[PDB]
Amino acid sequence: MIIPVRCFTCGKIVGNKWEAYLGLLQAEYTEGDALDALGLKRYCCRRMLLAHVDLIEKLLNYAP
Amino acid sequence: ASRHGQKGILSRLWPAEDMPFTESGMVPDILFNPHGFPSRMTIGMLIESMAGKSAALHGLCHD
Amino acid sequence: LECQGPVVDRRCPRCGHEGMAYHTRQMRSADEGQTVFYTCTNCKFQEKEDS
Ligand SMILES: [Zn+2]
Numbered sequence: 001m002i003i004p005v006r007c008f009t010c011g012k013i014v015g016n017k018w019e020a021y022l023g024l025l026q027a028e029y030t031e032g033d034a035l036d037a038l039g040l041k042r043y044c045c046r047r048m049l050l051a052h053v054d055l056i057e058k059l060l061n062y063a064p
Numbered sequence: 065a066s067r068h069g070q071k072g073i074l075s076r077l078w079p080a081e082d083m084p085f086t087e088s089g090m091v092p093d094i095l096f097n098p099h100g101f102p103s104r105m106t107i108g109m110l111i112e113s114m115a116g117k118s119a120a121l122h123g124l125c126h127d
Numbered sequence: 128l129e130c131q132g133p134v135v136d137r138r139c140p141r142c143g144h145e146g147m148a149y150h151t152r153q154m155r156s157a158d159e160g161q162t163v164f165y166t167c168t169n170c171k172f173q174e175k176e177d178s
């Protein structure tokens with residue numbers, strides 16, 4: 001739905017790395033460097049942001 | 065369950081300091097037995113394990 | 128107008144022959160296992176293993 005605040009495996013704060021991740025991907029970085037240049041080093045954290053489907057823009061369309 | 069049809073009931077929530085941390089600093093997330101493999105022969109789970117590790121380490125998405 | 132299947136080098140319980148012909152059959156549910164049927168080459172003693 002929305003990005004988890006902490007990474008699941010080891011609790012790095014990854015909730016503050018989502019808008020700056022989309023910003024790196026719109027600026028023509030690759031996902032192997034938009035996860036490198038945010039400071040996500042272990043693959044348990046890079047799992048959390050690469051594989052995340054932000055399912056709340058589709059969910060807010062049904063707005064009153 | 066995983067996606068290779070190998071159900072596992074949740075038995076015990078083991079605290080994080082007790083988990084075997086790796087050489088990279090990572091604890092695991094789910095511990096799975098080696099003893100679900102020789103009778104059920106899910107080679108697809110081992111290749112999915114290697115492939116998910118090699119995809120999260122590179123940003124790729126693997127076919 | 129045979130050789131009773133492929134052999135595996137397993138010792139028989141009765142006659143002690145070095146090999147037993149085997150046949151598999153998935154007799155349980157789809158949840159677990161594969162039941163292996165053995166048959167000795169010489170004295171034809173059939174036992175089953177459940178893995
Ligand atoms: Zn982590």
Ligand SMILES: [Zn+2]
Nearest residue numbers: 139142167170
């Ligand atoms: Zn025999």
